[PDB]
Amino acid sequence: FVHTYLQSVRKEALRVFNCIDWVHKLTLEITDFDGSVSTIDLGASSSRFTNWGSVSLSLDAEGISGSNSFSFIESPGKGYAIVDEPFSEIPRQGFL
Amino acid sequence: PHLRNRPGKGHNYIDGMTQEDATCKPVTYAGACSSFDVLLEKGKFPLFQSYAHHRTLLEAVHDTIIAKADPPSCDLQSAHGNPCMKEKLVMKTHCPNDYQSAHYLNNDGKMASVKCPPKYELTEDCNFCRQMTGASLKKGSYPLQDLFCQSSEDDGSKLKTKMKGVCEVGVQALKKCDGQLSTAHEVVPFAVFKNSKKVYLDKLDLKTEENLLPDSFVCFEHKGQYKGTMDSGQTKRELKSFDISQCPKIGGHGSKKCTGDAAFCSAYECTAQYANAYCSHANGSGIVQIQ
Amino acid sequence: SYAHHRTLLEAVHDTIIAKADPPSCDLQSAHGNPCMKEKLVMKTHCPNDYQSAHYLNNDGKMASVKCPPKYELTEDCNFCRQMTGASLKKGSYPLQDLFCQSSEDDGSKLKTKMKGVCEVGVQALKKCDGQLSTAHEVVPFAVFK
Amino acid sequence: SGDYYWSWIRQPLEWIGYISYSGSTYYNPSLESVYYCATNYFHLHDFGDLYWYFDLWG
Amino acid sequence: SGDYYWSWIRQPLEWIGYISYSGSTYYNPSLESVYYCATNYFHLHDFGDLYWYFDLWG
Amino acid sequence: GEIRCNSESSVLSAHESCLRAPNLISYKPMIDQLECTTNLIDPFVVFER
Amino acid sequence: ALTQPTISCTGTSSDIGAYNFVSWYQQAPKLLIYDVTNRPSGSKSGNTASLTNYYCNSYTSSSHVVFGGGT
Amino acid sequence: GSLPQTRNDKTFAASKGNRGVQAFSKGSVQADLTLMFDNFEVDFVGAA
Amino acid sequence: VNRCLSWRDNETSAEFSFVGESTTMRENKCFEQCGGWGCGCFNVNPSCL
Amino acid sequence: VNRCLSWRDNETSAEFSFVGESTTMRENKCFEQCGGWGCGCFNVNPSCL
Ligand SMILES: *[C@@H]1O[C@H](CO)[C@@H](O)[C@H](O)[C@H]1NC(C)=O
Numbered sequence: 001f002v003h004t005y006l007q008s009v010r011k012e013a014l015r016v017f018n019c020i021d022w023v024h025k026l027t028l029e030i031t032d033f034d035g036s037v038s039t040i041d042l043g044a045s046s047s048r049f050t051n052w053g054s055v056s057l058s059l060d061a062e063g064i065s066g067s068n069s070f071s072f073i074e075s076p077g078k079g080y081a082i083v084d085e086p087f088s089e090i091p092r093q094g095f096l
Numbered sequence: 097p098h099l100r101n102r103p104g105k106g107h108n109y110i111d112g113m114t115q116e117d118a119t120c121k122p123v124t125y126a127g128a129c130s131s132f133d134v135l136l137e138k139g140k141f142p143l144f145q146s147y148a149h150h151r152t153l154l155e156a157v158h159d160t161i162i163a164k165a166d167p168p169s170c171d172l173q174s175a176h177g178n179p180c181m182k183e184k185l186v187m188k189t190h191c192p193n194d195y196q197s198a199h200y201l202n203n204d205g206k207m208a209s210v211k212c213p214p215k216y217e218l219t220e221d222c223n224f225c226r227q228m229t230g231a232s233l234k235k236g237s238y239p240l241q242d243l244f245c246q247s248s249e250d251d252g253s254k255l256k257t258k259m260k261g262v263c264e265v266g267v268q269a270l271k272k273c274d275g276q277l278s279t280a281h282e283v284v285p286f287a288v289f290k291n292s293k294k295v296y297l298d299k300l301d302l303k304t305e306e307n308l309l310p311d312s313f314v315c316f317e318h319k320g321q322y323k324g325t326m327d328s329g330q331t332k333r334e335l336k337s338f339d340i341s342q343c344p345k346i347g348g349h350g351s352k353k354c355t356g357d358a359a360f361c362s363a364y365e366c367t368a369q370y371a372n373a374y375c376s377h378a379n380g381s382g383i384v385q386i387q
Numbered sequence: 388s389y390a391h392h393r394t395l396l397e398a399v400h401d402t403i404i405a406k407a408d409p410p411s412c413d414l415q416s417a418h419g420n421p422c423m424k425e426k427l428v429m430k431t432h433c434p435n436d437y438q439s440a441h442y443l444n445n446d447g448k449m450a451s452v453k454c455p456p457k458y459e460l461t462e463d464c465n466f467c468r469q470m471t472g473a474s475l476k477k478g479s480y481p482l483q484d485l486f487c488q489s490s491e492d493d494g495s496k497l498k499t500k501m502k503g504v505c506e507v508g509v510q511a512l513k514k515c516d517g518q519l520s521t522a523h524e525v526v527p528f529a530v531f532k
Numbered sequence: 533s534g535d536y537y538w539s540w541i542r543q544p545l546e547w548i549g550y551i552s553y554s555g556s557t558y559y560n561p562s563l564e565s566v567y568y569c570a571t572n573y574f575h576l577h578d579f580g581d582l583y584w585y586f587d588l589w590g
Numbered sequence: 591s592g593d594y595y596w597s598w599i600r601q602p603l604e605w606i607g608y609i610s611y612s613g614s615t616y617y618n619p620s621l622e623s624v625y626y627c628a629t630n631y632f633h634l635h636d637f638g639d640l641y642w643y644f645d646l647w648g
Numbered sequence: 649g650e651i652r653c654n655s656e657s658s659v660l661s662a663h664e665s666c667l668r669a670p671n672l673i674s675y676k677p678m679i680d681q682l683e684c685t686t687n688l689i690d691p692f693v694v695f696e697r
Numbered sequence: 698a699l700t701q702p703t704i705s706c707t708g709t710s711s712d713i714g715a716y717n718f719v720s721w722y723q724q725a726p727k728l729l730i731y732d733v734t735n736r737p738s739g740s741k742s743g744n745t746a747s748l749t750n751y752y753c754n755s756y757t758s759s760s761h762v763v764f765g766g767g768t
Numbered sequence: 769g770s771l772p773q774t775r776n777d778k779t780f781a782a783s784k785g786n787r788g789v790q791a792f793s794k795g796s797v798q799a800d801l802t803l804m805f806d807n808f809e810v811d812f813v814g815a816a
Numbered sequence: 817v818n819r820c821l822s823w824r825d826n827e828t829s830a831e832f833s834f835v836g837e838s839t840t841m842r843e844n845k846c847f848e849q850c851g852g853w854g855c856g857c858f859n860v861n862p863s864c865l
Numbered sequence: 866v867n868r869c870l871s872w873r874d875n876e877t878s879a880e881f882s883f884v885g886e887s888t889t890m891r892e893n894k895c896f897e898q899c900g901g902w903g904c905g906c907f908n909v910n911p912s913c914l
């Protein structure tokens with residue numbers, strides 16, 4: 001009789017995800033009246049409730065830029081990376 | 097019934113209603129206290145039941161954490177023509193039957209209670225006193241609000257209620273408004289800080305951090321236990337409360353041999369001889385901080 | 388599972404396992420002595436009406452805890468409590484789950500080798516400073532000649 | 533009629549108890565289980581039932 | 591008060607039994623079912639209940 | 649119409665009967681304080697466009 | 698009960714210290730001073746009332762009536 | 769496969785503040801942002 | 817931990833009982849965090865948010 | 866409101882009970898309206914038609 005259990009070797013983990021689509025995203029610096037301490041970020045057809053009302057962005061050209069078939073890895077506090085395999089929701093032996 | 101090992105003194109009684117000192121002076125596993133057992137009923141007082149190892153309002157009052165208001169409890173028998181029942185009438189409560197008193201935390205951050213005349217009981221809304229012939233009133237007071245208290249030194253003199261779109265909450269007049277006024281009854285969370293008044297909040301973002309202070313340990317003893325208090329033959333297996341002030345601190349002096357779990361042994365000095373009491377670490381205790 | 392191997396008491400009576408110094412220091416006469424040290428680091432569970440309980444101490448011998456007369460060991464086997472009109476059992480509760488046997492293989496060079504352990508039970512494996520995760524765990528153990 | 537509290541006092545004073553207009557009875561804690569009867573009959577207060585302001589002694 | 595063991599001895603010594611401060615009774619195995627009563631009253635040990643150090647004989 | 653309702657009152661009161669897509673809310677459980685935020689198409693902007 | 702020997706009626710925090718309902722009787726005794734000062738002269742300070750056979754009674758936190766020892 | 773990698777002319781890379789990834793691709797957009805209720809005025813600015 | 821990952825989005829925690837019954841659109845999540853004296857808890861198993 | 870949106874078309878309201886049982890083709894609807902003193906009702910939750 002054999003009882004086997006897995007244990008983690010390194011005290012770190014990696015997060016694997018995929019990008020279904022890419023979205024245009026504009027960063028604005030709001031040089032307000034008597035003071036320019038205001039920086040905002042917003043996407044297509046979206047509004048942000050800043051001071052003195054709100055600021056909206058149309059960006060009517062293209063709200064998307066297609067999709068992809070790779071996978072992305074994130075190591076928290078260390079950065080990101082790209083792996084050239086399709087993102088599979090079912091585990092497979094010999095893969096990521 | 098580990099929840100009946102109260103932190104601090106555990107004095108769950110109110111001034112004047114001192115006819116239940118057998119079981120409401122320090123609350124132990126044995127007796128039954130009317131002003132405490134209501135908190136442990138299933139489905140009622142869920143916020144305290146989550147933070148079950150923190151002090152109640154009466155416990156905080158008896159530890160001088162929370163002060164007592166001016167006219168601490170203006171009796172309806174002698175002061176029913178005085179502007180007393182003002183903060184109570186803006187709350188929507190629900191008292192059970194056979195209760196002659198009920199305590200709450202008033203606007204100033206102190207404890208005030210409503211006491212019916214003798215032989216009367218508070219109605220279902222705790223607003224009126226009614227008399228029933230041949231009824232046995234409970235000896236305690238019903239806790240009106242769902243709250244838990246603790247000991248803090250953080251100052252809050254600059255803390256004030258900041259609610260958006262609210263002209264007036266409870267008895268506090270936030271601002272002056274004219275026109276439409278949607279008036280309703282709502283469940284508002286609130287907090288009380290040192291040197292401040294009641295502070296109503298739009299959101300409740302609170303976190304707890306653990307420590308090794310004496311209030312975070314539950315120390316008990318057995319009844320009939322050899323070489324301990326109440327060392328006599330028993331007909332039932334029951335526990336007894338123990339005071340952690342006797343167990344020596346690590347690298348220190350004490351009066352009783354004391355053993356416990358990992359946290360206690362890390363904090364206090366666990367004995368190598370026969371122990372007098374067992375000191376476990378509190379289920380959920382700690383220090384709670386509100387955002 | 389190993390039901391046809393000797394118990395701790397059987398191994399003691401066959402001279403396989405020795406008896407510790409103070410074989411069982413009675414709590415009636417030696418409650419102020421540093422006896423209950425290896426027992427206090429174990430998490431046990433005794434039934435009721437038991438006046439004694441035996442275990443295999445660190446040195447590889449058999450020790451036991453005996454309550455004063457008419458007292459019984461509590462549910463954690465750490466204290467003695469007295470019940471009026473209770474009939475105590477005449478034996479001692481085996482604290483540990485173990486089986487013994489007769490062996491001639493030498494083990495004088497055998498020692499505990501646990502990775503990432505500063506201290507297990509009553510044995511101080513090494514000296515460590517900093518964070519120390521302290522817990523109760525089920526550790527298998529063996530005793531050799 | 534008039535919301536009175538009929539109380540009993542004794543001198544071997546010491547308050548024994550009162551019976552109210554509503555039939556509610558309140559007793560001294562020691563005696564829970566010359567004799568006079570005095571009640572607040574003239575100095576009535578509109579804000580409270582100050583029944584210990586004894587006058588009109590029996 | 592003082593955690594004493596009141597024991598009975600007889601001489602036709604021979605220990606009969608003791609009754610403890612806690613009410614626990616221990617008897618001689620043979621007699622389980624002149625008379626003196628001596629208890630350890632002065633030479634108390636903090637580490638154990640050495641009740642057979644008999645003094646203050648009855 | 650990622651979040652859609654059946655009446656103006658349901659929209660103005662955020663009633664639970666309104667339907668919405670899976671995973672609209674973005675959670676940032678960083679150790680100091682949580683950040684609950686989401687990016688939603690403003691229907692008024694599209695209406696004015 | 699209250700402690701009695703200007704006659705001074707000294708009590709605990711429950712009576713006099715909390716409530717201002719203390720009255721005096723002269724002995725079928727006759728009531729002289731009610732509500733500390735009102736007369737159909739007395740005063741209060743801390744837990745002790747003063748009046749310038751005289752008995753003092755007061756109202757306790759337990760809704761009871763406590764009579765003085767008497768002078 | 770650290771991020772600064774180019775695949776079929778896409779050149780994915782870390783976004784500023786390391787909060788995600790980007791995608792550098794040939795293209796352009798038309799942006800017409802709108803202000804609303806813009807009111808930010810004080811009195812001390814009356815001086816020249 | 818078993819309750820921590822298997823938290824249903826439509827089930828409310830006991831801490832937020834002052835919300836009680838509400839008709840607003842709402843969801844509930846549970847996130848594991850660090851466990852240890854540096855995190856703030858004596859236990860080393862992961863805490864919950 | 867829960868009864869208001871979930872109104873079955875074949876279920877008759879209690880107000881129109883003088884109709885009672887009829888063999889004519891018929892349907893029943895419920896519409897939310899304003900709620901507030903300007904609308905005509907002290908409550909601010911939406912009324913029903
Ligand atoms: C909604 O919650 C109830 C009670 O909490 C539960 O019985 C029901 O299964 C839940 N609905 C789901 C999980 O779809």
Ligand SMILES: *[C@@H]1O[C@H](CO)[C@@H](O)[C@H](O)[C@H]1NC(C)=O
Pocket residue numbers: 873875876877
């Ligand atoms: C018609 O009405 C009856 C009673 O009102 C109901 O039981 C039945 O389900 C309805 N038919 C539907 C909803 O198709």
